[model samples]
Target: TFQYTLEATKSGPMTYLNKGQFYAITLSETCFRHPISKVRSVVMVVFSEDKNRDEQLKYWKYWHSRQHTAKQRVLDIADYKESFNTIGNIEEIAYNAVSFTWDVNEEAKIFITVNCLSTDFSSGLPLMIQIDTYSYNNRSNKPIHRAYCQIKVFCDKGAERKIRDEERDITYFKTMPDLHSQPVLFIPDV
Candidate 1:
């Protein structure tokens, strides 16, 4: 039963179909070397398009750099508890996908990178990056209004654990899904 017709002969339109690829992000295991013990990241090199490695690498690197910057900001924000070495994962971030359009007639490659990687000070007082975001569409270097962020404290560690030994098995990384209010726009380039 043909609900609709699937068209072919797409003729290499190059926006998607066999056009782009994303390399793996080497997530290090040394943010204070967590309790799980240090482990090696993926031990393999990755490539996007071998045909135009330069072009592909350029975008890949650019995107990675941008993505890294966003993640770093999250890390920076988490430094709220820098006074004490005590730890737990502290960063609210989101996916940053870049779109490119090499309009055959447009001379060169034009791209639009978008993603929301922001956290907030919450009742958790200053910790916990509630995964408070949603799928969205925003221009390059612009605010992703779809995703929202806020500060709502859920104080901990006091009643949970009083000593380092009691904090055993704990790590410097953690996350939770949506658990608060609506959207707010104070950051961008996401």
Candidate 2:
């Protein structure tokens, strides 16, 4: 299991809680509308939280939107996965160093795995992870960090998968570049 203590601090531009408190984090499936395949399997993870509900929701929305757009345009279009012979499961583990767990699918394959931490789902805030990718040999192609939401609050339950708008506590929308840089991580660590 993953565990970390949250710390409360006030920075120059903003004040945030460290790892402690608790967060309701979430991860959504990568939405790709294939011309022939109408929605395929969708998987997501959602954690419950008792504090920072408002902040967590806001951050979730921002990060989700930014991630989707960035992956489709920059990461996907660039073929970053293929360039590195990427095929694997990308897991973002929060709680400490914003680590990434990647299970590769081929031998002598390289790929980038990014692990982003965030305080909330805002764009202007500083990003947690910049470049998180990995490479391996004799690995199996799993899921990469193509899309996910990291809300800063802990919950009693595990992660869940649901429509973006269905959730009342949180809201989802498109990426706003003017508000935040594409692919910004919301989790804060100090």
Candidate 3:
């Protein structure tokens, strides 16, 4: 049994990224030694849960499925000029699912760039970073393991959000001595 694990780090809970800015996330693996040549790891960036979910999933399936040739995959990832090429702005602001070489205990820095902010998210936009580990020829639907980093992105110049303020008070005092240096009273003290 080749047990494998994928770990995600360096992804902040929220980010304020302007257009053309790069956001990076890190991925590391354990027990992922490939028998032969290095395998391929796909980093998929998709809009987090939204109303148009099924359509996005369908496109992702086509994008990553083994049915397409390497050339077709490259063309689709680069950009499709056709009107009905793919569905939704998901692919527009997609940031694309690029591949990286993977080996045992490999660590990779995945960079994502958004050209423009979508109007749908006035407050903040949400995106997910998914990493898949597998070989080039192997077409298994499920890979070794799945790891995700969820991010909330704010593209506006300045966005307002609620924050908590904490306040505290402290007092200092001295204790009285057993003998009472002043000795104001204590009639029959020993």
lDDT of 1 by residue, 29-138 (tens): 11122242321110111121222445434433454455446542211121222211322222233232211111111122111111211111111111112112121223
Q: What is candidate 2's local distance difference test score?
A: 0.27
Clashes of 1: 18
Alpha carbon lDDT at 45, candidate 3: 54
List the global CA lDDT of all models.
0.21, 0.27, 0.38
List, residue by residue over 1-190, the lDDT tens digit for candidate 3: 1222212112223333344444444444433344653555555555555336555555444434432343222111223332122211223212245655644344444344543343323324465444455555576655554444444333443222211111111111112122111111101111
lDDT of 1 at 61: 40
Model 2 agreement with the true structure over 142-164: per-residue lDDT tens digits: 31222223332212211221122
Candidate 1 yields a Cα-based lDDT of: 0.21
Q: How much is the lDDT of residue 78 in candidate 1?
A: 16
Better of 1 and 3 by TM-score: 3
